[PDB]
């Protein structure tokens with residue numbers, strides 16, 4: 470019965486992670502010391518309840534930009550064009566001139582986007598190695614390499630109109646570069662017209678795959 | 685050790701459910717008896733492998749319409765911005781005049797959409813009570829009630845431009861009916877301009893939340 474743990478305190482507003490892997494607002498209604506660490510009981514605003522580890526709760530405020538760094542464990546807004554969801558990720562880039570003063574987020578499922586400071590929430594008790602709670606092993610391993618090598622970031626230069634092969638579902642596909650935005654490129658898959666924003670250091674882009682397998 | 689279980693045959697193309705709850709093409713590489721039933725080993729096209737229950741694999745073909753019914757357990761195409769994913773659900777409506785010859789799908793996460801016959805795949809070994817493998821209990825219970833009562837479906841009649849309260853994250857929001865499509869309405873949330881398709885029998889729509897209470 471930990472009524473408090475640092476600035477965590479029962480009755481506070483909080484975000485908690487659900488089994489959809491999206492994050493939702495609620496109230497912290499209990500803290501319990503249990504075996505090695507602590508667990509946080511959240512009552513979500515839709516009345517659901519969950520007992521969560523400290524890396525599965527986030528503060529209901531936007532961190533000051535000067536408290537974030539490459540590797541920071543965050544919850545960020547994800548937008549499909551009509552709906553908005555909150556999903557966990559890693560800060561891959563902080564605001565700078567070339568990225569038009571945005572944060573690049575690497576989400577736990579492998580997606581990447583640029584967001585603003587007002588679209589982020591800090592996870593309360595992230596693991597010492599921030600990537601170690603990423604479920605997708607290929608994503609986890611990529612983040613570990615990326616944060617460890619930062620700022621050494623191999624990327625490929627692409628231009629609008631350029632024709633390249635892009636990976637999807639374990640095979641290569643004919644694709645076209647539609648647009649470049651900072652460290653991201655918008656790829657059109659020519660066969661079925663899906664579009665995707667992809668990190669320019671991703672080995673899903675054949676030139677990066679190659680530039681990295683160049684022997 | 686089996687090479688065949690009915691028309692599940694080692695080497696066949698298949699869809700398998702991953703931990704993202706999306707479904708992905710692969711090959712059936714093994715059939716194993718483990719404990720009381722069978723498991724199906726799938727090698728995904730990206731070379732990952734999973735040992736899956738029969739309700740977590742689907743055939744890689746579109747079922748004949750008129751072999752689908754209300755309650756059928758299916759995998760359906762979902763549009764996520766400019767991306768397309770496969771996700772499990774239940775058939776809520778079969779093609780008719782009112783729905784412009786489409787299938788209404790109630791997805792396992794509570795979303796609903798109309799799809800065509802070429803956007804569906806049949807799950808290989810669904811449970812006889814097909815909803816019983818839905819993880820979200822509120823969703824599971826809704827589907828059980830819906831299928832049991834079908835065709836008797838309380839729904840509210842809405843028209844484009846109508847202003848109503850719609851529930852989201854446990855509170856009620858000023859919203860507007862933008863469009864009616866069969867048993868779905870497209871709701872604009874006026875505060876933040878999110879848009880969402882919602883079933884006209886959902887108690888997230890204030891008028892339905894009251895029609896139900898009135899009964």
Ligand SMILES: CN1C[C@H](Nc2nc3cc[nH]c3c(=O)n2C)C[C@H](c2ccc(OCc3ccccc3)cc2)C1
Nearest residue numbers: 489491547554556576578579580665764765767793794
């Ligand atoms: C960050 N990811 C992004 C993902 N998109 C995406 N990922 C990748 C990866 C490589 N490429 C791409 C790509 O192109 N995209 C477009 C959608 C994903 C998501 C997950 C659950 C959910 O659940 C919604 C929900 C439903 C019911 C109740 C609560 C929540 C909604 C969205 C979040």
Ligand SMILES: CN1C[C@H](Nc2nc3cc[nH]c3c(=O)n2C)C[C@H](c2ccc(OCc3ccccc3)cc2)C1
Nearest residue numbers: 552578579704706762764769771791793794795880881
């Ligand atoms: C069917 N549901 C629909 C859901 N949308 C949605 N649901 C609800 C529920 C009430 N309302 C709404 C609403 O408005 N929406 C818009 C997105 C959800 C999804 C899940 C995972 C995923 O993962 C993508 C992925 C990423 C990396 C690797 C593999 C896969 C992509 C999409 C699927």
